[PDB]
Amino acid sequence: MKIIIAGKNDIAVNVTRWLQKKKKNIEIYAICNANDTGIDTFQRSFKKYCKDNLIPIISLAEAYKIDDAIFLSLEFDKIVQPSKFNHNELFNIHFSYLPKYKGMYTSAWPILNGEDTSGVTLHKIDHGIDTGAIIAQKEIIIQPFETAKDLYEKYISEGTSLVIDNISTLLNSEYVEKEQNIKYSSYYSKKTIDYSNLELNFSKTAFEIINQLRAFTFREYQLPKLDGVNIFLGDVLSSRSIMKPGSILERNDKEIIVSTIDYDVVLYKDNFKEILEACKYSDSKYIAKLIRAKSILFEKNIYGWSPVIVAAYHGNIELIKWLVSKGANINDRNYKGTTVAMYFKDYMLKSGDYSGLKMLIDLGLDLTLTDYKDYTVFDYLEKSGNKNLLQYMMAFMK
Amino acid sequence: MKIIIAGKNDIAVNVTRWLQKKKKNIEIYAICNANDTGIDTFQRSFKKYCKDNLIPIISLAEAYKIDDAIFLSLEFDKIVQPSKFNHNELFNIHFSYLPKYKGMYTSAWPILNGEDTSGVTLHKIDHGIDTGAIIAQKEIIIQPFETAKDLYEKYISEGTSLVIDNISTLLNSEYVEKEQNIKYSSYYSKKTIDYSNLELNFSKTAFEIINQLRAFTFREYQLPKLDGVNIFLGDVLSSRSIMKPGSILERNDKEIIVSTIDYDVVLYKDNFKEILEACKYSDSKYIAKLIRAKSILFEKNIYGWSPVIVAAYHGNIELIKWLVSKGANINDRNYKGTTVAMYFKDYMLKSGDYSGLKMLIDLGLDLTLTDYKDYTVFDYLEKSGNKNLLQYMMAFM
Numbered sequence A: 001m002k003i004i005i006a007g008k009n010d011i012a013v014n015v016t017r018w019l020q021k022k023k024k025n026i027e028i029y030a031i032c033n034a035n036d037t038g039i040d041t042f043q044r045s046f047k048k049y050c051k052d053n054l055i056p057i058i059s060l061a062e063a064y065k066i067d068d069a070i071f072l073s074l075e076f077d078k079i080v081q082p083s084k085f086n087h088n089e090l091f092n093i094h095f096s097y098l099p100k101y102k103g104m105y106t107s108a109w110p111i112l113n114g115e116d117t118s119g120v121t122l123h124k125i126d127h128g129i130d131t132g133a134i135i136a137q138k139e140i141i142i143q144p145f146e147t148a149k150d151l152y153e154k155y156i157s158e159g160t161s162l163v164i165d166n167i168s169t170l171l172n173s174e175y176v177e178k179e180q181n182i183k184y185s186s187y188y189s190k191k192t193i194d195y196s197n198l199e200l201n202f203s204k205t206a207f208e209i210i211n212q213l214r215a216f217t218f219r220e221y222q223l224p225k226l227d228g229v230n231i232f233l234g235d236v237l238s239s240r241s242i243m244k245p246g247s248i249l250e251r252n253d254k255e256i257i258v259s260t261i262d263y264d265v266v267l268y269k270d271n272f273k274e275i276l277e278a279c280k281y282s283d284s285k286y287i288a289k290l291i292r293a294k295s296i297l298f299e300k301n302i303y304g305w306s307p308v309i310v311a312a313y314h315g316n317i318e319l320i321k322w323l324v325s326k327g328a329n330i331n332d333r334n335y336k337g338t339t340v341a342m343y344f345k346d347y348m349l350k351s352g353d354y355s356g357l358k359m360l361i362d363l364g365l366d367l368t369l370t371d372y373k374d375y376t377v378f379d380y381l382e383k384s385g386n387k388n389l390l391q392y393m394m395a396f397m398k
Numbered sequence B: 001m002k003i004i005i006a007g008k009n010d011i012a013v014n015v016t017r018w019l020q021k022k023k024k025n026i027e028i029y030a031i032c033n034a035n036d037t038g039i040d041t042f043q044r045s046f047k048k049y050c051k052d053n054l055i056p057i058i059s060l061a062e063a064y065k066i067d068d069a070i071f072l073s074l075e076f077d078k079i080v081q082p083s084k085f086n087h088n089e090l091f092n093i094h095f096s097y098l099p100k101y102k103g104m105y106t107s108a109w110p111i112l113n114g115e116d117t118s119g120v121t122l123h124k125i126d127h128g129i130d131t132g133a134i135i136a137q138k139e140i141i142i143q144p145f146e147t148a149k150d151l152y153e154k155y156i157s158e159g160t161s162l163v164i165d166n167i168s169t170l171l172n173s174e175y176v177e178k179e180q181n182i183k184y185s186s187y188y189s190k191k192t193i194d195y196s197n198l199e200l201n202f203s204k205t206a207f208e209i210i211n212q213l214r215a216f217t218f219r220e221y222q223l224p225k226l227d228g229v230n231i232f233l234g235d236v237l238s239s240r241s242i243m244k245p246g247s248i249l250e251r252n253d254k255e256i257i258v259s260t261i262d263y264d265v266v267l268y269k270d271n272f273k274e275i276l277e278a279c280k281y282s283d284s285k286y287i288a289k290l291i292r293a294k295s296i297l298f299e300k301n302i303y304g305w306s307p308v309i310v311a312a313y314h315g316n317i318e319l320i321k322w323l324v325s326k327g328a329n330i331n332d333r334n335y336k337g338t339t340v341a342m343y344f345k346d347y348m349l350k351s352g353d354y355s356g357l358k359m360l361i362d363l364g365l366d367l368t369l370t371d372y373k374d375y376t377v378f379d380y381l382e383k384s385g386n387k388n389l390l391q392y393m394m395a396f397m
């Protein structure tokens, strides 16, 4: 049978990849979003993927004319008109637990509002915005540390899983739907946040303010700013200044302390670039000092280089171990899919120091992984003619 | 002992009244809010009550020096310096379930936000706004139909009872405090709502839109408006218009139906004026046809006249009975505390017809009540020398 996948980012890519794997009998057509540049960024380009995999890319107007297909929307950017199809097998993943948080910026609004939870919802496309009947959902816990970016990445992951768990019933017409309730229904348009003019509001509680920081913390788009200085999270003090809300109590190199309606807050200056530079050659002890919010250790620059990737490229094995102890992914990837192991290989090759591989492997380092060109570390070693190092690396795999 | 009552409205008045009744020996001092107009309105004037009962009004600066008082803020308008008193018996009633909804407009924001409940909270005055340790608090249901005014009245009533239930522990220092949690706190300033520029936003869900209506419904202040027409509540329909949200789908003498993000909503035009006028003489069958939202029957005009009060003064007994069956208060009062019974008394004097009295008494009419000059219907009848009716009403007692 046939499926049209309409949308973007790792959710479209990964739903597609699964289909090519487990449903090879299925003709796939793609619709891409107007702003998919064709180049991989912090999310994969769906357009790139479809080109690289000979998946035909069509228009929505063309998709309307395909019979005996289902249609599946995944962060799609176009209004879909149900009457224009010759069927009603029209499905969307929305990044909320409907009926709450219809519309936009669902990575921010639940955080701003102090929600503990959100979700992803599979539903029918009807004539309105995220109004159609619910087929499946999955609740997501928002952790107190988590940013809008963390929550978006959870949406992407949980949304992928929910499709995968339901896509057979979508293909079989063996699914059940239920109309959305009136009660609790909520919606935010794009007018509700003006990302070109964000401003922290300190006439609020400390809880609210920290939730502002979190909601606006999505590095590839922006960081919250106080007085032009970029902030990466904050914490609540027990202190309660009688200075009017917004008054800056202290300023140092690492932080700004501000008066609120209730408890003082400390806003950490974003020092990610500096942290990343230190990852080349410093140890544990130095990095632990630079750090304020722990999750800053999992951020990435514009190439997708994290702390643990930089450490790997420079053979900083003591730091790699500490980072992984803190939550870092031993198999982290840049935006081309290049893995920690590949970067470590570069170090081994340069230094002639092979000795640290065993320890990384015991931390979970995976030599089988492929980048987005379908190459393993061994592909690169074969190409560069480094057969002895290739054999050496294979000898430690388990 | 002594207490300084700082604040306004029926909560200030009714806590004071209770203390004069039940704690004879407590000396009371008052601080009034600056905007207290000295005239009884939808809330009683605390300054008027203090003058009329010889409760001395003091300044804040004076209050700081009375070392042996406790201090109770009841919608007080001035920020205090806690450390400046030589005691720490400083208490406040806040109209939310703290630490949620610190600050202003707490009869609006919970409704707007889609909350099922709010609360009232008795707590210490400390550094922060509304940040002091909690002594006692109670949750309050917000019914799906209730307006900001309904919620406000509830905060006044539940706040008063919360103070009454705890006031002995406050004067005797036998209360327990628990510091407020950081988590879940929320706060809204005066700037969060411009009441001089309310606008309904139709780029929202039906649930959200009906909540806006409710939240902005507070007649003595304003009603929400569409196309300059005032609206008194609404409902959600089952249809889902394809038109862009905010599009007017239907318009008539009763109501306006509008498209939203999800379900269409009907906004009911405010016909309170019309209803109140017909309460003079029309019967329940006619008045029933006018009603778009049931709670309109408990609204009041600028003098505090409700449908039941107007019906009583015009001797409309058949209407009174139906109104009461719909949940009207048989002892409703205007803003001067004049009761239904006193209005019915006027009608009995003008008409010479006492035939309705027994039935209203059977429905709960209370002849013992006192207006805000502290007179009963009997006092009035004596003064007027209306000896016949006096005799008859007294026969019920």
Ligand SMILES: Cc1cn([C@H]2C[C@H](O)[C@@H](COP(=O)(O)OP(=O)(O)O)O2)c(=O)[nH]c1=O
Pocket: A075, A104, A105, A106, A107, A108, A148, A152, A195, A216, A217, A218, A221, A222
């Ligand atoms: C547009 C924009 C979005 N965001 C946040 C809020 C969104 O929920 C989240 C993802 O938005 P977006 O990347 O537009 O993803 P989608 O198109 O799949 O919604 O990013 C920002 O932090 N800054 C921005 O400028």
Ligand SMILES: Cc1cn([C@H]2C[C@H](O)[C@@H](COP(=O)(O)OP(=O)(O)O)O2)c(=O)[nH]c1=O
Pocket: A303, A305, A309, A310, A313, A334, A336, A337, A338, A343
């Ligand atoms: C991680 C890292 C890489 N590099 C080098 C290694 C690569 O040769 C080069 C290109 O970056 P990159 O975007 O990682 O491309 P690829 O996925 O092809 O590696 O940058 C540094 O110079 N410093 C670093 O910290």
Ligand SMILES: Cc1cn([C@H]2C[C@H](O)[C@@H](COP(=O)(O)OP(=O)(O)O)O2)c(=O)[nH]c1=O
Pocket: B009, B075, B104, B105, B106, B107, B108, B148, B152, B195, B216, B217, B218, B221, B222
């Ligand atoms: C000032 C104002 C308040 N309100 C509502 C929201 C407030 O929670 C409610 C009570 O406000 P107010 O009468 O100022 O009482 P308090 O000072 O005890 O809060 O009235 C309006 O609807 N319109 C208005 O213009």
Ligand SMILES: Cc1cn([C@H]2C[C@H](O)[C@@H](COP(=O)(O)OP(=O)(O)O)O2)c(=O)[nH]c1=O
Pocket: B303, B304, B305, B309, B310, B313, B334, B335, B336, B337, B338, B343
């Ligand atoms: C209830 C009602 C009262 N009245 C009269 C009788 C009232 O005593 C008079 C003044 O009303 P009001 O100003 O409300 O003061 P009071 O406390 O004395 O009632 O108006 C009407 O004319 N029409 C009415 O519908």
Ligand code: NA
Pocket: A082, A083, A084, A085, A086, A087
């Ligand atoms: Na069709």
Ligand code: NA
Pocket: A190, A191, A192, A193, A194, A195
């Ligand atoms: Na916007």
Ligand code: NA
Pocket: A240, A241, A242, A243, A244, A245, A259, A260, A261, A262, A263, A264
């Ligand atoms: Na402060």
Ligand code: NA
Pocket: B190, B191, B192, B193, B194, B195
């Ligand atoms: Na205001």
Ligand code: NA
Pocket: A128, B240, B241, B242, B243, B244, B245, B259, B260, B261, B262, B263, B264
């Ligand atoms: Na609509």
